[PDB]
Amino acid sequence: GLSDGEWQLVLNVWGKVEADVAGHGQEVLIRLFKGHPETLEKFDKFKHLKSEDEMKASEDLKKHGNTVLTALGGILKKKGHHEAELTPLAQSHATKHKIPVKYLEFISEAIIQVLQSKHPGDFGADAQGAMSKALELFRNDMAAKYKELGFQG
Ligand code: HEM
């Protein structure tokens, strides 16, 4: 549960990611790969990128960042009523990609790091706390679906 006011600060800052979705997606995955290299091991398509210059050059890394943030935007706009948007994600991530929950935590922190670097002016103390609670609900709900799916890391 976030208040209505919190959901508003979340959608507001989300408006700035939507003015450049692939741009922000690409830096989130770089921040993630740079910050927890082990996460790169889950991506066949990218385990061959050896440096930040190669990641930056990567057209497919950019398309995938786009995918990720377009999926996450759809969830956020639901303001917590996102079961339907969430299921399919939990099903592939658990069964197919075998992504532990800690990895969800890693990407949540890269998302916040990107918004802080790119929009300091808009991403003050209030927007920061609201976005954190929004990503923390997303992860708690993903963890529970995992659980009913019979998994979890
Ligand atoms: C904010 C959290 C995330 C979102 C919204 C998200 C979204 C997606 C979407 C929409 C797809 C494509 C359709 C599907 O397979 O479900 C995808 C595929 C994938 N995801 Fe995620 N993801 C997230 C986090 C993660 C993390 C943290 C990892 C790895 C450490 C990861 C690994 C993968 C892989 C390996 C694929 C298939 C990539 C390919 O085409 O080879 N995801 N993700």
Swiss-Prot record:
One of the record's GO molecular function terms: peroxidase activity
Disulfide partners: none
Gene Ontology CC entries for this record: sarcoplasm
Main location: cytoplasm
GO biological process terms held by the UniProt record: oxygen transport; removal of superoxide radicals
Binding positions for nitrite per the UniProt entry: 64
Matches recorded under PANTHER family: MYOGLOBIN
Purpose of the protein: Monomeric heme protein which primary function is to store oxygen and facilitate its diffusion within muscle tissues. Reversibly binds oxygen through a pentacoordinated heme iron and enables its timely and efficient release as needed during periods of heightened demand. Depending on the oxidative conditions of tissues and cells, and in addition to its ability to bind oxygen, it also has a nitrite reductase activity whereby it regulates the production of bioactive nitric oxide.
Protein family membership: Belongs to the globin family.
Subunit structure: Monomeric.
Protein name: Myoglobin
Organism from which the protein derives: Sus scrofa
Encoding gene per record: MB
